[PDB]
């Protein structure tokens with residue numbers, strides 16, 4: 196017989212190791228590894244040792260490694276042994292490591308993690324977690340120091356019109372952290388409460404408490420959560436109920452998507468929103484969007500903006516001057532609050548009387564303002580937000596192809612439309628993928644999470660390491676799948692109850708039941724009424740992005756869709772996904788039911804819920820309807 200038996204190496208250091216023992220991969224890669232003699236083994240007795248100040252990091256790492264390795268790993272202070280992982284903050288190593296870099300020394304004193312900041316240590320611990328969670332507990336000795344090439348590395352997450360659940364957001368933040376991604380542009384509505392803004396408290400919105408909680412999580416992971424309220428275009432979710440602030444065309448037709456930048460009250464309204472957001476985000480940036488103001492039309496149709504431009508910025512001024520003037524006035528406004536403005540590149544155009552302020556970060560997504568190379572010449576600060584790194588649920592033109600970009604030598608200097616700039620441009624901040632809902636019934640948020648995996652690893656690698664150590668994309672892919680998700684994602688209880696037959700009293704106004712629950716590949720349920728044989732759907736009501744956003748919309752019974760199929764089945768998407776339900780457990784015990792696409796919660800309507808939508812239509816009192824969680828958490 197073969198005699199095959201586990202090696203079972205003693206814990207700690209060994210001067211003996213095979214010369215080509217695998218070094219488990221990480222993402223980002225840690226390039227320029229120097230090999231040492233021997234190897235180190237996590238095993239019984241291994242501890243995470245640190246100073247008091249690093250105690251929380253050490254405790255979280257010990258707990259996490261205990262779970263991945265099945266070895267009891269505890270945190271400690273004091274002296275470290277060769278059996279141990281040590282965490283060290285050495286702020287004198289800024290030159291070598293910068294603000295986010297780290298050094299690993301693996302050898303006879305154990306596995307040392309050194310960073311120059313708390314986040315550097317944390318980012319080193321992500322590599323330790325990666326290297327140890329792939330079924331190999333012995334690591335080759337040696338040393339490496341790594342630090343990111345670019346300062347801003349991450350994603351646009353448009354949690355916009357539709358709601359991206361806070362649970363999704365928490366998972367996303369965990370994934371970003373694992374990948375050393377430090378930037379998320381979160382276009383989103385914070386629920387407006389003031390007398391002057393509260394009519395825009397339509398769903399999607401996030402509560403102050405909710406935002407505070409995910410910003411605190413983000414910040415502990417080294418992530419800058421930058422809010423965006425897009426202006427002066429794409430303003431439908433803000434202006435629908437404020438027609439007094441909407442821009443009219445020459446014929447008097449208003450667009451709920453356009454702010455009237457000639458109306459000072461409209462401008463004040465936008466600034467009021469800024470001030471509401473200032474209380475809950477911690478970032479030093481404000482992103483005002485500024486994309487697609489005139490989509491589907493032109494400035495020729497808005498003579499009033501030319502008139503305004505001339506009054507405001509002098510004879511000869513054009514609507515493009517008025518537009519840029521509005522951006523510079525918002526720049527002034529946020530600077531006075533201690534923030535730096537960011538915009539999308541596309542409305543930056545041909546001005547006469549006004550020039551765009553150079554202290555505004557330009558996030559470049561569209562070959563449309565200047566070429567990037569033109570903007571470089573003028574000294575603008577640039578982030579690469581190419582459409583090559585977009586996903587959309589509906590627009591199939593936008594699906595990131597990581598294999599292609601990896602193989603074709605894309606780098607962070609490769610601006611939209613294959614427009615290359617010096618990737619060492621000293622005002623090139625980094626790069627990001629972008630995750631856009633657009634027509635939103637085609638894919639659940641859970642399907643988006645499955646789809647974005649590869650691309651998130653791609654961008655992580657190219658913004659930190661700017662290298663291609665895997666010979667092809669396919670070699671990368673094999674290692675990223677081995678590395679897998681971070682612990683929080685593996686722990687998330689997608690489907691907390693077993694498929695089976697249930698009594699659900701909340702649903703009595705639809706049917707006496709019982710209900711047959713089955714699970715879906717994307718972590719939802721379909722609920723079949725055993726009386727009618729039909730399935731529960733959230734199908735009807737006023738929509739944004741083709742998803743029901745109406746507060747107080749009622750579910751209904753419909754012929755049962757096939758919820759077992761994938762997102763490639765685009766023809767049946769809406770009936771399918773309107774039949775998916777997310778079930779969550781309380782802290783502690785009780786279950787809530789949420790339409791998967793909408794992320795509101797089913798509740799029995801009391802008639803005392805307060806929301807602008809309900810001022811004009813309420814579900815009949817005592818019937819089951821969807822509501823944002825804040826209206827039914829009493």
Ligand SMILES: CC(=O)N[C@H]1CN[C@H](CO)[C@@H](O)[C@@H]1O[C@@H]1O[C@H](CO)[C@H](O)[C@H](O)[C@H]1O
Pocket residue numbers: 353355356382425429484486487539560585587590593631632633634
């Ligand atoms: C900056 C940008 O990409 N602007 C738009 C054009 N491309 C993407 C992908 O199709 C669009 O999603 C972008 O518009 C954004 O749409 C969302 C809803 O999906 C919001 O309305 C944003 O305000 C808008 O910028």
